[PDB]
Structure formats: structure tokens, C-alpha cells
Amino acid sequence: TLNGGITDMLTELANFEKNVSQAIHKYNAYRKAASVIAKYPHKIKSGAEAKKLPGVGTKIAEKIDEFLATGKLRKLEKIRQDDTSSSINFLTRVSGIGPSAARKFVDEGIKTLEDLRKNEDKLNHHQRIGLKYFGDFEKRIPREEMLQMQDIVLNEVKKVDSEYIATVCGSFRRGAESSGDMDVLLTHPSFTSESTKQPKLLHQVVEQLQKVHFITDTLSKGETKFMGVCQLPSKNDEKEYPHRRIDIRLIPKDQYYCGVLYFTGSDIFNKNMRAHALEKGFTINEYTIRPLGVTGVAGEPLPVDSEKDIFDYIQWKYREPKDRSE
DNA sequence: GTCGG
DNA sequence: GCTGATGCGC
DNA sequence: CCGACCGCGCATCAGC
Numbered sequence: 498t499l500n501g502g503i504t505d506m507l508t509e510l511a512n513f514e515k516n517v518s519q520a521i522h523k524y525n526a527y528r529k530a531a532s533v534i535a536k537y538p539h540k541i542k543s544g545a546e547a548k549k550l551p552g553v554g555t556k557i558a559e560k561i562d563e564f565l566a567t568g569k570l571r572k573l574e575k576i577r578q579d580d581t582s583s584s585i586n587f588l589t590r591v592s593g594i595g596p597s598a599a600r601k602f603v604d605e606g607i608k609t610l611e612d613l614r615k616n617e618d619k620l621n622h623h624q625r626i627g628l629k630y631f632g633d634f635e636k637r638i639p640r641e642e643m644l645q646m647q648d649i650v651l652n653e654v655k656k657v658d659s660e661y662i663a664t665v666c667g668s669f670r671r672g673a674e675s676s677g678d679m680d681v682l683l684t685h686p687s688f689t690s691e692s693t694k695q696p697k698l699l700h701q702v703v704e705q706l707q708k709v710h711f712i713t714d715t716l717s718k719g720e721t722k723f724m725g726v727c728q729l730p731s732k733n734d735e736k737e738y739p740h741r742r743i744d745i746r747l748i749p750k751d752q753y754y755c756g757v758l759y760f761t762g763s764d765i766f767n768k769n770m771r772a773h774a775l776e777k778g779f780t781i782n783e784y785t786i787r788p789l790g791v792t793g794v795a796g797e798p799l800p801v802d803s804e805k806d807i808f809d810y811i812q813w814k815y816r817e818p819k820d821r822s823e
Numbered sequence: 824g825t826c827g828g
Numbered sequence: 829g830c831t832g833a834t835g836c837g838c
Numbered sequence: 839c840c841g842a843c844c845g846c847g848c849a850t851c852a853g854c
């Protein structure tokens with residue numbers, strides 16, 4: 498929080514471009530700037546100083562000067578006053594409602610939490626569950642709770658098939674003291690890039706977790722990716738825990754390292770690493786890292802035996818999970 | 824909105 | 829039904 | 839300047 502005021506300002510700007518303006522590149526431009534500044538070990542004294550960092554250009558430099566001089570930004574002040582922008586920004590906070598849906602609802606007169614509640618019929622499945630747990634999904638998850646959650650997930654998975662390997666990734670693997678949700682990477686020997694010898698591998702696990710009442714709702718579910726809701730069990734007479742978002746990704750067992758790298762993040766770290774990969778002539782996804790031929794077409798998967806091998810290919814020193822929070 | 828060639 | 833584009837989210 | 843901006847699973851829709 499050394500330059501919290503500035504990073505918060507850029508984040509709000511980023512959210513505006515994304516939610517209201519539907520300008521994804523500007524969104525990421527602001528996010529990159531916020532990121533590099535949050536990483537900066539000094540208390541910024543001027544926009545000129547900030548402009549030295551990659552990602553911070555003229556426009557943002559001017560904004561930082563204004564914020565330092567007055568403690569605020571007029572551009573944001575006007576945005577906050579705008580009701581449409583405010584309404585669209587708010588609605589996008591519901592899981593399942595993005596910029597388009599948010600602008601459409603506002604067009605229909607639906608602009609508040611109360612409005613959504615009296616219009617459930619106009620929401621799809623995902624949006625309905627996001628509204629249901631709106632309050633809860635805004636809460637943080639203490640690492641202590643993440644630990645109890647990990648215990649339940651790993652043990653239940655083990656009960657279905659001892660050959661399953663469940664790994665909690667996301668901010669948790671990065672060592673965060675609190676997480677916004679739980680991210681679970683899952684592998685099983687019968688599912689490789691070479692073949693699928695067993696169907697319902699992901700289904701079985703989801704099923705088991707619902708059986709024990711851990712998973713309470715489903716936002717989306719396919720053969721390899723589950724997106725839903727879970728809840729820790731509470732003791733007698735005590736208030737129950739908030740419901741939490743849970744994502745489970747089944748990845749070919751032989752592509753574990755690319756999968757755990759992807760699912761460990763951060764999202765900005767992944768974007769930076771994938772972009773660097775390209776510059777180095779490689780393309781990276783959650784499955785593999787491939788060289789880019791002369792034409793720029795991806796070649797065959799390169800051998801990977803650790804997360805480090807991936808870093809080595811793009812000529813980056815290895816970075817522990819805890820140092821990938823950008 | 825920012826950057827490299 | 830399928831395929832492709834688009835919205836959404838990780 | 840100006841083209842590039844990471845890469846992809848699932849739900850939903852149009853058009854067939």
C-alpha cells in the first residue's frame with residue numbers, strides 16, 4: 498500500500514474502461530500501470546518519476562500529478578457522479594453479469610440490487626446464483642479457512658479415487674494471507690494428452706463434493722472445468738460460513754506443470770509471461786509451451802518437467818509462486 | 824493507454 | 829442437431 | 839506513426 502492511492506485510482510479507471518467503455522485494451526493498460534506501480538519500492542513523488550516505469554505513459558503521468566497535488570482525480574469524480582456508469586459498474590459486480598449484460602439491464606430500467614431481485618426471471622442460471630450469493634462473494638477468505646477447505650477437498654477427492662491429485666492454486670499457492678476464492682487443479686492418470694481412459698473424471702469429484710454438502714451450487718460445468726459454489730461446515734449453534742466461489746480444472750496429467758503455472762497466476766503475471774514468451778518466439782497456454790515457427794505458427798509441444806523448464810525456455814530466472822503476484 | 828521497430 | 833461468434837470468467 | 843495487446847472452457851445465441 499506504499500502507493501495505494503495511485504494504484505486504487507488506476508484500478509478504478511481500469512474497471513471503468515472495462516465495464517462502461519468496453520475498452521479492453523485500455524482496461525489492461527491501466528491494470529499494467531497499477532501493477533508496475535504496486536511493485537515499485539518507493540513512494541512516488543511525481544508523474545515524471547512514475548513515467549519512468551514501463552506501462553506508465555504521458556496520460557497516466559498527468560493523472561498521477563493531479564492525484565498527488567489534490568488527492569483525487571476529476572475524471573473519476575465525474576464518472577462517480579454519472580448514474581449510468583455507476584449502475585453499469587455496480588451490476589458487473591454480480592458474477593455472470595458482464596459489461597454488455599450490465600448495460601442492457603440498465604437499458605431495461607434494472608439498475609439496483611433491489612431491481613435484480615425482482616427480475617430474477619430475466620437472469621440466466623449463472624447470473625441467478627451470483628445474485629443469490631452477491632454479498633458472500635464480496636467477502637475475503639482467511640487463509641485458515643482456505644486450509645480447512647483444502648483439507649476437505651483433498652480428502653474427498655482421495656475417497657473417490659486414490660490416484661487423483663488435487664492441488665490448490667491461485668493466490669493460495671502464492672502464499673496469500675487471504676483469497677477471493679478457491680482454485681483447484683485436478684489430475685488423474687487415466688486422463689493424459691494421449692488419451693481419456695475414464696469418463697466422468699471431473700463429474701465424480703464434483704458429485705462427491707456435493708454429496709458431502711461442500712459444493713452447494715453450480716455456475717457452469719464441463720468435462721474439464723467446473724465453476725461453482727462451496728461452503729465450510731459449521732459447528733452446533735454457530736453462524737455458518739459465507740458461501741465461496743470454487744473453480745476446479747481437470748488437466749491432462751502429463752501437462753501438469755503448464756497447468757499449475759497457469760492456475761497459480763497471477764492473471765497479470767500470466768499475461769506478462771505469455772507476452773514475453775511470444776517475444777522470445779514461444780507460445781504458452783495451460784497445456785504446453787511451443788516454439789513459434791518462421792510463419793509464426795505454433796510447433797509441437799516442448800518437453801517440460803517442472804515449472805522452471807518453462808521459465809528457462811523463455812530465458813527468465815525462476816520465480817517462486819510467492820513472487821508471481823503482479 | 825502504452826509500447827517497440 | 830451442428831458450427832461459429834460472442835459474452836463471461838478463470 | 840501504428841499494429842499489437844495471452845489464451846481458452848463453458849453457456850448461449852444465430853443461422854443452417
Ligand SMILES: Nc1nc2c(ncn2[C@H]2C[C@H](O)[C@@H](COP(=O)(O)OP(=O)(O)[C@@H](Cl)P(=O)(O)O)O2)c(=O)[nH]1
Nearest residue numbers: 667668676677678680759760761762763764767838
Ligand atoms: N492466462 C490467464 N490466466 C488467468 C486469467 N485469469 C485468471 N487466470 C489464472 C491465474 C490465476 O491465478 C488463476 C486463478 O484465477 P483467480 O481469478 O482465482 O485469481 P487468483 O486466484 O489469482 C486471485 Cl484474483 P483470488 O481468487 O484469490 O482473489 O487463473 C487470465 O485472464 N489469463
Ligand SMILES: [Cl-]
Nearest residue numbers: 520521522523
Ligand atoms: Cl480498448
Ligand SMILES: [Cl-]
Nearest residue numbers: 752754755801
Ligand atoms: Cl507440463
Ligand SMILES: [Cl-]
Nearest residue numbers: 782784785798
Ligand atoms: Cl496445446
Ligand SMILES: [Mg+2]
Nearest residue numbers: 667668678680
Ligand atoms: Mg482464485
Ligand code: NA
Nearest residue numbers: 548549550553
Ligand atoms: Na514509462
Ligand code: NA
Nearest residue numbers: 589591593594
Ligand atoms: Na460480473
Ligand code: NA
Nearest residue numbers: 678679680744
Ligand atoms: Na478462481
